[PDB]
Amino acid sequence: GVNKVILVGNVGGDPETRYMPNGNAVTNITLATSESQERTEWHRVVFFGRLAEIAGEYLRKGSQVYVEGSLRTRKWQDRYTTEIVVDINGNMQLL
Amino acid sequence: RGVNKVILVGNVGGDPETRYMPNGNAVTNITLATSESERTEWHRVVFFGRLAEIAGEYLRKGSQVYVEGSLRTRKWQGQDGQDRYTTEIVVDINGNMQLLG
Amino acid sequence: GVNKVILVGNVGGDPETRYMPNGNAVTNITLATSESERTEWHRVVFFGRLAEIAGEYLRKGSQVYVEGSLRTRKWQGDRYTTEIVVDINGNMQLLG
Amino acid sequence: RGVNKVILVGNVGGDPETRYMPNGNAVTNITLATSEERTEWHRVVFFGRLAEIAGEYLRKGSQVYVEGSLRTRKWQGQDGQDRYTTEIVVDINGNMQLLG
Ligand SMILES: O=c1c(O)c(-c2ccc(O)c(O)c2)oc2cc(O)cc(O)c12
Protein backbone atom coordinates (compact mmCIF):
# COMPACT_ATOMS: atom_id res chain seq x y z
CA GLY A 1 0.00 0.00 0.00
CA VAL A 2 0.88 3.64 0.68
CA ASN A 3 2.22 4.92 3.99
CA LYS A 4 3.00 8.60 3.91
CA VAL A 5 3.42 11.36 6.49
CA ILE A 6 4.04 15.02 5.80
CA LEU A 7 4.83 17.36 8.70
CA VAL A 8 5.82 20.99 8.99
CA GLY A 9 6.62 21.96 12.54
CA ASN A 10 9.22 23.06 15.04
CA VAL A 11 12.04 20.96 16.43
CA GLY A 12 11.52 20.54 20.16
CA GLY A 13 15.11 19.83 21.17
CA ASP A 14 18.64 19.23 19.98
CA PRO A 15 18.92 16.32 17.50
CA GLU A 16 20.32 13.12 18.98
CA THR A 17 22.75 11.65 16.49
CA ARG A 18 24.32 8.26 17.03
CA TYR A 19 26.44 6.25 14.64
CA MET A 20 26.24 2.71 13.65
CA PRO A 21 29.57 0.87 13.33
CA ASN A 22 28.61 0.39 9.72
CA GLY A 23 29.11 4.18 9.73
CA ASN A 24 25.53 5.25 9.15
CA ALA A 25 24.24 8.10 11.30
CA VAL A 26 20.78 7.90 12.84
CA THR A 27 19.09 11.09 14.03
CA ASN A 28 16.06 11.36 16.35
CA ILE A 29 14.12 14.59 16.98
CA THR A 30 10.83 15.77 18.35
CA LEU A 31 8.72 17.96 16.06
CA ALA A 32 5.81 20.15 17.23
CA THR A 33 2.74 20.82 15.12
CA SER A 34 -0.17 22.90 16.39
CA GLU A 35 -3.71 23.65 15.22
CA SER A 36 -5.84 26.63 16.24
CA GLN A 37 -7.54 28.05 21.72
CA GLU A 38 -4.54 26.00 20.51
CA ARG A 39 -3.37 22.38 20.84
CA THR A 40 0.13 21.09 20.07
CA GLU A 41 0.99 17.64 18.72
CA TRP A 42 4.37 16.03 19.34
CA HIS A 43 5.86 13.66 16.76
CA ARG A 44 8.81 11.28 17.11
CA VAL A 45 10.77 11.59 13.86
CA VAL A 46 13.77 9.38 13.09
CA PHE A 47 16.17 10.25 10.26
CA PHE A 48 18.25 7.57 8.54
CA GLY A 49 21.07 7.83 6.03
CA ARG A 50 22.41 11.11 4.72
CA LEU A 51 19.29 13.02 5.79
CA ALA A 52 20.34 12.02 9.32
CA GLU A 53 23.66 13.79 8.79
CA ILE A 54 21.90 16.86 7.37
CA ALA A 55 19.31 16.80 10.16
CA GLY A 56 21.82 16.12 12.92
CA GLU A 57 23.80 19.18 11.76
CA TYR A 58 21.47 21.82 10.48
CA LEU A 59 18.60 21.35 12.94
CA ARG A 60 18.37 23.04 16.35
CA LYS A 61 15.72 23.77 18.98
CA GLY A 62 13.07 25.94 17.39
CA SER A 63 14.12 25.04 13.85
CA GLN A 64 11.22 25.07 11.42
CA VAL A 65 11.54 22.00 9.20
CA TYR A 66 9.53 20.14 6.59
CA VAL A 67 9.52 16.36 6.85
CA GLU A 68 8.21 13.56 4.64
CA GLY A 69 8.34 9.98 5.80
CA SER A 70 6.58 6.76 6.72
CA LEU A 71 4.73 5.65 9.86
CA ARG A 72 6.43 2.84 11.76
CA THR A 73 5.27 1.47 15.12
CA ARG A 74 8.08 -0.39 16.87
CA LYS A 75 7.95 -2.58 19.97
CA TRP A 76 10.59 -2.16 22.67
CA GLN A 77 11.41 -2.95 26.32
CA ASP A 78 6.19 -3.88 26.31
CA ARG A 79 5.98 -0.30 25.09
CA TYR A 80 5.04 0.73 21.57
CA THR A 81 6.22 3.91 19.84
CA THR A 82 4.88 5.12 16.49
CA GLU A 83 7.76 6.97 14.85
CA ILE A 84 7.88 8.91 11.59
CA VAL A 85 10.77 7.30 9.70
CA VAL A 86 12.58 9.54 7.18
CA ASP A 87 15.01 7.70 4.91
CA ILE A 88 16.11 7.73 1.25
CA ASN A 89 12.44 7.13 0.38
CA GLY A 90 11.51 10.22 2.43
CA ASN A 91 12.45 13.88 2.34
CA MET A 92 13.33 16.83 4.57
CA GLN A 93 13.61 20.58 3.94
CA LEU A 94 15.00 23.28 6.23
CA LEU A 95 12.78 26.34 6.53
CA ARG B 1 1.24 26.41 13.77
CA GLY B 2 2.13 23.86 11.12
CA VAL B 3 1.18 20.90 8.97
CA ASN B 4 0.18 17.44 10.20
CA LYS B 5 -0.81 15.12 7.38
CA VAL B 6 -1.04 11.36 6.82
CA ILE B 7 -2.02 9.61 3.62
CA LEU B 8 -2.61 5.88 3.69
CA VAL B 9 -3.78 3.38 1.14
CA GLY B 10 -4.30 -0.10 2.53
CA ASN B 11 -6.70 -2.79 3.61
CA VAL B 12 -9.17 -2.68 6.49
CA GLY B 13 -8.24 -5.32 9.06
CA GLY B 14 -11.67 -5.97 10.58
CA ASP B 15 -15.26 -4.84 10.33
CA PRO B 16 -15.55 -1.27 11.51
CA GLU B 17 -16.96 -0.16 14.79
CA THR B 18 -19.30 2.75 15.02
CA ARG B 19 -20.36 4.55 18.13
CA TYR B 20 -22.93 7.25 18.40
CA MET B 21 -22.21 9.95 20.96
CA PRO B 22 -25.10 11.16 23.16
CA ASN B 23 -25.17 14.19 20.82
CA GLY B 24 -25.67 12.07 17.67
CA ASN B 25 -22.17 12.43 16.20
CA ALA B 26 -20.65 9.16 15.03
CA VAL B 27 -17.14 7.88 15.82
CA THR B 28 -15.84 5.00 13.69
CA ASN B 29 -12.64 3.08 14.57
CA ILE B 30 -10.77 0.74 12.20
CA THR B 31 -7.40 -0.92 11.80
CA LEU B 32 -5.68 -0.30 8.47
CA ALA B 33 -2.82 -2.42 7.09
CA THR B 34 -0.15 -1.11 4.72
CA SER B 35 2.55 -3.35 3.25
CA GLU B 36 6.09 -2.88 1.94
CA SER B 37 8.20 -5.74 0.59
CA GLU B 38 6.96 -8.22 3.38
CA ARG B 39 6.58 -5.87 6.35
CA THR B 40 2.98 -5.00 7.22
CA GLU B 41 2.35 -1.83 9.22
CA TRP B 42 -0.90 -1.74 11.20
CA HIS B 43 -2.50 1.68 11.69
CA ARG B 44 -5.27 2.81 14.07
CA VAL B 45 -7.65 5.03 12.08
CA VAL B 46 -10.55 6.90 13.74
CA PHE B 47 -13.25 8.74 11.73
CA PHE B 48 -15.35 11.64 13.02
CA GLY B 49 -18.35 13.48 11.68
CA ARG B 50 -19.87 12.67 8.31
CA LEU B 51 -16.91 10.47 7.38
CA ALA B 52 -17.59 8.24 10.38
CA GLU B 53 -21.06 7.29 9.17
CA ILE B 54 -19.70 6.63 5.67
CA ALA B 55 -16.71 4.64 6.90
CA GLY B 56 -19.03 2.59 9.14
CA GLU B 57 -21.55 1.98 6.37
CA TYR B 58 -19.08 1.15 3.61
CA LEU B 59 -15.81 -0.15 5.08
CA ARG B 60 -15.66 -3.90 5.73
CA LYS B 61 -12.88 -6.31 6.60
CA GLY B 62 -10.59 -6.50 3.58
CA SER B 63 -11.89 -3.26 2.06
CA GLN B 64 -9.21 -1.29 0.22
CA VAL B 65 -9.44 2.34 1.22
CA TYR B 66 -7.64 5.65 0.86
CA VAL B 67 -7.36 7.72 4.01
CA GLU B 68 -6.13 11.28 4.58
CA GLY B 69 -5.98 12.59 8.13
CA SER B 70 -3.77 13.82 10.96
CA LEU B 71 -1.65 12.16 13.63
CA ARG B 72 -2.92 12.26 17.21
CA THR B 73 -1.05 10.61 20.09
CA ARG B 74 -3.21 9.89 23.15
CA LYS B 75 -1.59 9.37 26.55
CA TRP B 76 -3.04 7.04 29.22
CA GLN B 77 -1.95 5.31 32.40
CA GLY B 78 -2.05 1.53 32.09
CA GLN B 79 -3.43 -0.70 34.86
CA ASP B 80 0.17 -1.22 36.00
CA GLY B 81 0.27 2.53 36.63
CA GLN B 82 2.70 3.25 33.80
CA ASP B 83 2.39 5.84 31.05
CA ARG B 84 1.39 4.54 27.62
CA TYR B 85 0.82 6.27 24.29
CA THR B 86 -1.44 5.39 21.36
CA THR B 87 -0.88 7.21 18.04
CA GLU B 88 -3.95 7.32 15.82
CA ILE B 89 -4.78 8.76 12.41
CA VAL B 90 -7.74 11.12 12.89
CA VAL B 91 -9.99 11.55 9.82
CA ASP B 92 -12.37 14.45 10.34
CA ILE B 93 -13.78 17.32 8.29
CA ASN B 94 -10.15 18.31 7.58
CA GLY B 95 -9.42 14.84 6.16
CA ASN B 96 -10.68 12.59 3.40
CA MET B 97 -11.74 9.02 2.67
CA GLN B 98 -12.33 7.16 -0.60
CA LEU B 99 -13.53 3.58 -1.02
CA LEU B 100 -11.29 1.91 -3.59
CA GLY B 101 -11.80 -0.80 -6.18
CA GLY C 1 -11.27 10.68 -6.78
CA VAL C 2 -8.27 12.26 -5.03
CA ASN C 3 -6.62 15.46 -6.35
CA LYS C 4 -3.95 16.82 -4.03
CA VAL C 5 -0.91 19.04 -4.51
CA ILE C 6 1.55 20.04 -1.82
CA LEU C 7 4.16 22.70 -2.55
CA VAL C 8 7.00 24.35 -0.68
CA GLY C 9 8.71 27.19 -2.51
CA ASN C 10 9.24 30.92 -2.89
CA VAL C 11 6.75 33.51 -4.12
CA GLY C 12 7.75 34.72 -7.56
CA GLY C 13 6.34 38.23 -7.56
CA ASP C 14 3.98 40.00 -5.32
CA PRO C 15 0.44 38.69 -4.73
CA GLU C 16 -2.19 40.06 -7.11
CA THR C 17 -5.36 40.44 -5.04
CA ARG C 18 -8.65 40.92 -6.85
CA TYR C 19 -12.26 40.32 -5.92
CA MET C 20 -15.14 38.48 -7.55
CA PRO C 21 -18.77 39.50 -8.18
CA ASN C 22 -19.48 37.83 -4.82
CA GLY C 23 -16.99 40.18 -3.26
CA ASN C 24 -14.99 36.97 -2.75
CA ALA C 25 -11.26 37.54 -2.40
CA VAL C 26 -8.87 35.85 -4.84
CA THR C 27 -5.07 35.99 -4.73
CA ASN C 28 -2.83 34.80 -7.55
CA ILE C 29 0.86 34.03 -7.16
CA THR C 30 3.53 32.15 -8.97
CA LEU C 31 5.54 29.80 -6.81
CA ALA C 32 8.94 28.37 -7.68
CA THR C 33 10.20 24.94 -6.64
CA SER C 34 13.69 23.67 -7.50
CA GLU C 35 14.87 20.15 -8.34
CA SER C 36 18.32 18.53 -8.39
CA GLU C 37 19.15 24.02 -10.60
CA ARG C 38 15.96 23.36 -12.58
CA THR C 39 13.10 25.58 -11.47
CA GLU C 40 9.45 24.68 -11.88
CA TRP C 41 7.03 27.62 -11.77
CA HIS C 42 3.56 26.99 -10.39
CA ARG C 43 0.48 29.18 -10.93
CA VAL C 44 -1.34 29.18 -7.57
CA VAL C 45 -4.73 30.72 -6.81
CA PHE C 46 -6.17 31.26 -3.34
CA PHE C 47 -9.84 31.75 -2.49
CA GLY C 48 -11.86 32.70 0.54
CA ARG C 49 -10.12 33.27 3.85
CA LEU C 50 -6.78 32.01 2.52
CA ALA C 51 -6.75 34.53 -0.35
CA GLU C 52 -7.11 37.45 2.06
CA ILE C 53 -4.20 36.11 4.11
CA ALA C 54 -1.98 35.39 1.08
CA GLY C 55 -2.30 39.02 -0.03
CA GLU C 56 -1.79 40.25 3.54
CA TYR C 57 1.35 38.27 4.38
CA LEU C 58 3.03 37.11 1.14
CA ARG C 59 5.67 39.24 -0.58
CA LYS C 60 8.08 38.54 -3.41
CA GLY C 61 10.60 36.02 -2.13
CA SER C 62 8.65 34.71 0.85
CA GLN C 63 8.78 30.95 1.48
CA VAL C 64 5.40 29.21 1.49
CA TYR C 65 3.72 25.84 2.00
CA VAL C 66 0.53 25.39 -0.01
CA GLU C 67 -1.89 22.51 -0.35
CA GLY C 68 -4.63 22.41 -2.94
CA SER C 69 -6.06 20.82 -6.04
CA LEU C 70 -5.20 20.83 -9.74
CA ARG C 71 -7.66 22.78 -11.86
CA THR C 72 -7.16 23.02 -15.64
CA ARG C 73 -9.07 26.12 -16.73
CA LYS C 74 -10.03 26.80 -20.34
CA TRP C 75 -9.95 30.10 -22.21
CA GLN C 76 -9.65 31.20 -25.82
CA GLY C 77 -7.63 34.44 -25.84
CA ASP C 78 -8.57 27.83 -27.37
CA ARG C 79 -6.10 27.30 -24.51
CA TYR C 80 -5.60 25.59 -21.14
CA THR C 81 -3.98 26.69 -17.86
CA THR C 82 -3.38 24.25 -15.00
CA GLU C 83 -3.69 25.85 -11.56
CA ILE C 84 -3.15 24.75 -7.98
CA VAL C 85 -6.39 25.93 -6.39
CA VAL C 86 -6.07 26.57 -2.65
CA ASP C 87 -9.50 27.11 -1.11
CA ILE C 88 -11.33 25.83 1.99
CA ASN C 89 -10.33 22.29 1.00
CA GLY C 90 -6.63 23.23 1.05
CA ASN C 91 -4.06 24.88 3.30
CA MET C 92 -1.32 27.46 3.32
CA GLN C 93 1.32 28.28 5.76
CA LEU C 94 3.73 31.13 5.96
CA LEU C 95 7.18 29.77 6.41
CA GLY C 96 10.36 31.54 7.49
CA ARG D 1 15.22 23.68 -2.35
CA GLY D 2 11.48 23.10 -2.50
CA VAL D 3 8.71 20.50 -2.47
CA ASN D 4 6.68 19.57 -5.58
CA LYS D 5 4.28 16.73 -4.91
CA VAL D 6 1.03 15.58 -6.49
CA ILE D 7 -1.10 12.68 -5.27
CA LEU D 8 -3.97 11.40 -7.41
CA VAL D 9 -6.52 8.61 -7.29
CA GLY D 10 -8.64 8.22 -10.40
CA ASN D 11 -9.47 6.39 -13.62
CA VAL D 12 -7.24 6.09 -16.68
CA GLY D 13 -9.08 7.69 -19.57
CA GLY D 14 -7.43 5.83 -22.45
CA ASP D 15 -5.24 2.84 -23.05
CA PRO D 16 -1.66 3.63 -21.98
CA GLU D 17 0.57 4.63 -24.88
CA THR D 18 4.01 3.16 -24.20
CA ARG D 19 7.09 4.47 -25.99
CA TYR D 20 10.82 3.72 -25.91
CA MET D 21 13.83 6.03 -26.07
CA PRO D 22 17.08 5.24 -27.95
CA ASN D 23 18.25 4.11 -24.49
CA GLY D 24 15.30 1.68 -24.54
CA ASN D 25 13.94 3.11 -21.30
CA ALA D 26 10.17 3.10 -21.05
CA VAL D 27 7.95 6.18 -21.28
CA THR D 28 4.21 5.60 -20.98
CA ASN D 29 1.52 8.23 -21.09
CA ILE D 30 -2.04 8.23 -19.74
CA THR D 31 -4.84 10.53 -18.82
CA LEU D 32 -6.45 10.19 -15.41
CA ALA D 33 -9.86 11.42 -14.30
CA THR D 34 -10.49 12.70 -10.80
CA SER D 35 -13.96 13.90 -9.87
CA GLU D 36 -16.13 14.91 -6.91
CA GLU D 37 -20.06 17.28 -9.81
CA ARG D 38 -16.86 18.14 -11.71
CA THR D 39 -14.34 15.94 -13.58
CA GLU D 40 -10.72 17.11 -13.70
CA TRP D 41 -8.56 15.51 -16.41
CA HIS D 42 -4.85 15.01 -15.73
CA ARG D 43 -1.90 14.28 -18.01
CA VAL D 44 0.32 11.72 -16.25
CA VAL D 45 3.56 10.43 -17.76
CA PHE D 46 5.55 7.50 -16.32
CA PHE D 47 9.31 6.84 -16.58
CA GLY D 48 11.77 4.14 -15.61
CA ARG D 49 10.61 0.97 -13.90
CA LEU D 50 7.13 2.42 -13.27
CA ALA D 51 6.64 3.13 -16.96
CA GLU D 52 7.00 -0.58 -17.75
CA ILE D 53 4.34 -1.47 -15.16
CA ALA D 54 1.83 1.19 -16.27
CA GLY D 55 1.87 -0.36 -19.75
CA GLU D 56 1.03 -3.98 -18.91
CA TYR D 57 -1.44 -3.53 -16.06
CA LEU D 58 -3.38 -0.31 -16.81
CA ARG D 59 -6.40 -0.33 -19.14
CA LYS D 60 -9.17 2.04 -20.21
CA GLY D 61 -11.20 2.79 -17.09
CA SER D 62 -8.78 1.45 -14.45
CA GLN D 63 -8.37 3.00 -10.98
CA VAL D 64 -4.85 3.92 -9.92
CA TYR D 65 -2.92 5.77 -7.23
CA VAL D 66 -0.17 7.99 -8.61
CA GLU D 67 2.37 10.10 -6.76
CA GLY D 68 4.56 12.46 -8.73
CA SER D 69 5.59 16.05 -9.33
CA LEU D 70 4.20 18.77 -11.56
CA ARG D 71 6.06 19.75 -14.72
CA THR D 72 4.97 22.38 -17.23
CA ARG D 73 6.55 22.17 -20.69
CA LYS D 74 6.65 25.10 -23.13
CA TRP D 75 6.07 24.55 -26.86
CA GLN D 76 5.40 26.72 -29.91
CA GLY D 77 2.20 25.66 -31.62
CA GLN D 78 1.96 25.75 -35.37
CA ASP D 79 1.16 29.49 -34.97
CA GLY D 80 4.57 30.26 -33.51
CA GLN D 81 2.49 31.12 -30.44
CA ASP D 82 3.53 29.90 -27.02
CA ARG D 83 1.50 27.16 -25.33
CA TYR D 84 1.98 25.25 -22.10
CA THR D 85 1.25 21.71 -20.95
CA THR D 86 1.33 20.78 -17.27
CA GLU D 87 1.85 17.07 -16.58
CA ILE D 88 2.33 14.84 -13.58
CA VAL D 89 5.74 13.15 -13.90
CA VAL D 90 5.94 9.78 -12.12
CA ASP D 91 9.50 8.49 -12.10
CA ILE D 92 11.81 6.69 -9.69
CA ASN D 93 11.07 9.53 -7.23
CA GLY D 94 7.31 8.97 -7.51
CA ASN D 95 4.97 6.07 -6.86
CA MET D 96 2.09 4.20 -8.46
CA GLN D 97 -0.39 1.60 -7.22
CA LEU D 98 -2.88 -0.47 -9.16
CA LEU D 99 -6.14 -0.70 -7.23
CA GLY D 100 -8.78 -3.40 -6.95
O1 LIG E 1 -14.05 22.95 6.42
C1 LIG E 1 -13.00 22.45 6.08
C2 LIG E 1 -11.68 22.96 6.52
O2 LIG E 1 -11.62 24.02 7.37
C3 LIG E 1 -10.52 22.36 6.14
C4 LIG E 1 -9.18 22.80 6.57
C5 LIG E 1 -8.34 21.83 7.13
C6 LIG E 1 -7.08 22.18 7.56
C7 LIG E 1 -6.65 23.50 7.42
O3 LIG E 1 -5.41 23.84 7.84
C8 LIG E 1 -7.50 24.47 6.84
O4 LIG E 1 -7.08 25.77 6.70
C9 LIG E 1 -8.78 24.12 6.41
O5 LIG E 1 -10.47 21.22 5.39
C10 LIG E 1 -11.66 20.73 4.90
C11 LIG E 1 -11.53 19.62 4.06
C12 LIG E 1 -12.72 19.10 3.54
O6 LIG E 1 -12.65 18.01 2.72
C13 LIG E 1 -13.98 19.63 3.83
C14 LIG E 1 -14.05 20.74 4.67
O7 LIG E 1 -15.27 21.28 4.96
C15 LIG E 1 -12.89 21.30 5.22
Side-chain angles (χ1 to χ4, degrees), chain A residues 35, chain B residues 2 93-96, chain C residues 49-50 87-92:
Chain A
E35 231 64 57
Chain B
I93 310 83
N94 310 313
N96 190 4
Chain C
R49 166 166 33 70
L50 294 182
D87 60 19
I88 64 111
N89 294 349
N91 200 11
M92 191 249 300

Side-chain angles (χ1 to χ4, degrees), chain A residues 35, chain B residues 2-5 50-51 68 70 92-97, chain C residues 4 49-50 65 67 86-93:
Chain A
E35 231 64 57
Chain B
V3 169
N4 178 347
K5 179 160 291 300
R50 203 182 72 94
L51 288 181
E68 171 189 355
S70 301
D92 62 9
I93 310 83
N94 310 313
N96 190 4
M97 199 249 303
Chain C
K4 274 300 129 193
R49 166 166 33 70
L50 294 182
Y65 164 104
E67 173 190 328
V86 180
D87 60 19
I88 64 111
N89 294 349
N91 200 11
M92 191 249 300
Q93 160 133 337

Side-chain angles (χ1 to χ4, degrees), chain A residues 1-92:
Chain A
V2 169
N3 177 351
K4 178 161 264 295
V5 183
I6 298 179
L7 312 158
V8 166
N10 271 268
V11 177
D14 272 344
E16 309 166 14
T17 291
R18 305 178 185 74
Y19 298 95
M20 317 276 115
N22 65 95
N24 286 321
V26 180
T27 295
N28 303 251
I29 69 172
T30 57
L31 184 158
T33 63
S34 81
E35 231 64 57
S36 317
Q37 177 49 36
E38 51 267 13
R39 191 225 291 210
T40 295
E41 195 66 33
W42 287 96
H43 311 265
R44 305 255 179 191
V45 180
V46 186
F47 295 97
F48 292 91
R50 291 121 305 287
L51 295 186
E53 314 266 18
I54 295 178
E57 125 126 350
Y58 273 102
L59 289 175
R60 307 290 183 239
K61 226 182 181 84
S63 273
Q64 196 186 30
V65 61
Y66 167 107
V67 152
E68 189 193 304
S70 275
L71 283 173
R72 192 212 44 195
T73 295
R74 56 162 167 107
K75 294 93 190 93
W76 54 283
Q77 57 187 298
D78 294 342
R79 300 261 185 275
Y80 303 70
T81 313
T82 298
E83 290 159 330
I84 294 98
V85 170
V86 176
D87 60 1
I88 180 72
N89 302 130
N91 188 31
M92 197 247 281

Side-chain angles (χ1 to χ4, degrees), chain D residues 8-30:
Chain D
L8 308 165
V9 177
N11 309 278
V12 184
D15 271 276
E17 224 277 356
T18 300
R19 283 205 286 87
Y20 295 99
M21 69 176 37
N23 210 146
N25 285 53
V27 48
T28 85
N29 289 255
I30 74 163

Side-chain angles (χ1 to χ4, degrees), chain B residues 53-97:
Chain B
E53 312 188 67
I54 292 176
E57 148 167 35
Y58 280 111
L59 295 192
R60 296 287 177 265
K61 177 199 260 143
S63 295
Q64 184 166 60
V65 64
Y66 169 98
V67 155
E68 171 189 355
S70 301
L71 287 162
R72 187 189 52 187
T73 291
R74 291 188 287 107
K75 158 171 184 183
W76 49 289
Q77 313 186 263
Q79 302 205 116
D80 40 69
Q82 300 247 258
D83 290 3
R84 290 223 165 69
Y85 299 89
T86 303
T87 301
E88 333 179 289
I89 297 84
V90 181
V91 187
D92 62 9
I93 310 83
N94 310 313
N96 190 4
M97 199 249 303

Side-chain angles (χ1 to χ4, degrees), chain C residues 76-91:
Chain C
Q76 269 55 247
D78 209 89
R79 336 189 48 90
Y80 284 108
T81 311
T82 299
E83 294 161 327
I84 294 82
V85 175
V86 180
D87 60 19
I88 64 111
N89 294 349
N91 200 11

